[PDB]
Design a protein around this ligand. Structure first.
Ligand SMILES: C[C@H](CCC(=O)NCCC[N+](C)(C)CCCS(=O)(=O)[O-])[C@H]1CC[C@H]2[C@@H]3[C@H](O)C[C@@H]4C[C@H](O)CC[C@]4(C)[C@H]3C[C@H](O)[C@]12C
Ligand SMILES: Nc1ncnc2c1ncn2[C@@H]1O[C@H](CSC[C@H](N)C(=O)O)[C@@H](O)[C@H]1O
Ligand code: SF4
Ligand SMILES: [C-]#N
Ligand SMILES: [C-]#N
Ligand SMILES: [Cl-]
Ligand SMILES: [Fe+2]
Length: 356
């Protein structure tokens, strides 16, 4: 037997970058990119994603104002503070009038997309949602729904009511892990919902959490390849943030740098997709969303849920700041975008096909 020495790390890292620049997206290339822990490799990866972002989606940072209108949920996901078994949380529901008028205010502040997100709350489904969507569509903006897993019939009604997009983060593409963490449902169910949403003509959003308990680098590679496979219009990625009132309270938090590399690789794989700098990135690191916008992201989603409900939508700890008024977030992200040298979106910021 003869030796089997490793190649030097710097030269290996440069070969990975070259393969990414040549769009040679093999599993081993993606795995090694995620595994390298070199500050200079990572910075070059971020700059490549930023370059691709500049070339294929430009300098507009699209603002999507989120109204989290109910924290009631019928599911029991192990990671989520809204899981039905968490009795330590005050639950709330907004009336349709509250939701519509709050959306109207965001539109007046300049949001060009309203995102309606909730727990899986049967109260609203399907007809209350349809009424709300129809009212918001009269305001001249795009509407995105993020309501979880529902029958095809509901998704069809909401499309007819005028919804433009649907965000259903796939969470994890590992079906064994998915079922362990989401004991009510399955990856197959989640994927079927995404396929139905695409067939109905929604712009569809997927995306995973990074750092889930039991998730490995190979699983993160599977997430990237799943996203590439379906050419998603939008991809929402962030770290897992443990919640103290859940079974995962004591697990490791997701790593910011690893999550940033997932955002960067997603931009490289899907050059003209819409990729938010998510709330969870801003929670985990001060300035986290600003950093993510320099590493391939092109969207920001200010929290527009009003007091006294905003503090109760406790997906994970630290999500909400209560130090400022509930109308500060849209002007605040506009200021952030200006300081980055970027521009707010001029239209609804729907995904375009300009890459290849
Ligand atoms: C706070 C400013 C000053 C140093 C800046 C970072 C560094 O510049 C390194 C790197 C350059 C990439 O290009 C974009 C990503 C990254 C992390 C920057 C992000 C952000 O801008 C930082 C955190
Ligand atoms: N602990 C957590 N850490 C980081 N992110 C978390 C966590 N808990 C939930 N989330 C994220 O919250 C998103 C919106 S819930 C909307 C709807 N009910 C749905 O399930 O699709 C989910 O897709 C998760 O990725
Ligand atoms: S992630 Fe969505 S479906 Fe799961 S418990 Fe939280 S709100 Fe409910
Ligand atoms: C996303 N809109
Ligand atoms: C989500 N931002
Ligand atoms: Cl988006
Ligand atoms: Fe989106």
């Amino acid at each position: 037997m003869w030796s089997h020495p490793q190649f030097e790390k710097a030269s290996t890292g440069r070969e990975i970058l070259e393969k990414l620049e040549r769009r040679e997206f093999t599993r081993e290339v993606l795995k090694e990119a995620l595994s390298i822990n070199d500050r200079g490799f990572n910075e070059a990866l971020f700059k490549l994603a930023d370059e691709i972002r500049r070339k294929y989606v430009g300098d507009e940072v699209h603002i999507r104002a989120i109204i989290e209108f109910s924290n009631v949920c019928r599911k029991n996901c192990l990671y989520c503070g809204l899981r039905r078994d968490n009795k330590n949380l005050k639950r709330y529901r907004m009336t349709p009038e509250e939701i519509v008028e709050r959306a109207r205010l965001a539109v007046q502040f300049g949001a060009k997309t309203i995102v309606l997100q909730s727990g899986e709350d049967p109260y609203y489904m399907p007809d209350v949602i349809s009424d709300i969507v129809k009212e918001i569509k009269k305001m001249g903006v795009a509407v995105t729904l993020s309501l979880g897993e529902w029958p095809r019939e509901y998704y069809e009604k909401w499309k007819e009511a005028g919804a433009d997009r649907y965000l259903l983060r796939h969470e994890t593409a590992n079906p064994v892990l998915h079922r362990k963490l989401r004991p009510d449902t399955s990856f197959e169910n989640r994927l079927n919902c995404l396929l139905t949403l695409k067939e109905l003509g929604y712009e569809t959003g997927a995306g995973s959490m990074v750092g889930l308990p039991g998730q490995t680098i190979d699983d993160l590679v599977d997430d990237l390849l799943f996203l590439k496979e379906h050419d998603f219009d939008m991809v929402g990625i962030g770290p897992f943030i443990p919640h103290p009132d859940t079974p995962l309270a004591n697990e490791k938090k997701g790593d910011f740098t690893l999550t940033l590399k997932m955002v960067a690789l997603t931009r490289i794989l899907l050059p003209d997709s819409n990729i938010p700098a998510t709330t969870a990135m801003g929670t985990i690191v001060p300035g986290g969303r600003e950093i993510t916008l320099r590493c391939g992201a092109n969207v920001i989603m200010p929290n527009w849920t009003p007091s006294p409900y905003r503090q109760l939508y406790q997906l994970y700890p630290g999500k909400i700041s209560v130090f400022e008024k509930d109308t500060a977030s849209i002007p605040s992200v506009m200021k952030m975008i200006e300081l980055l040298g970027r521009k707010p979106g001029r239209d609804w910021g729907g995904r375009k096909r300009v890459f290849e």
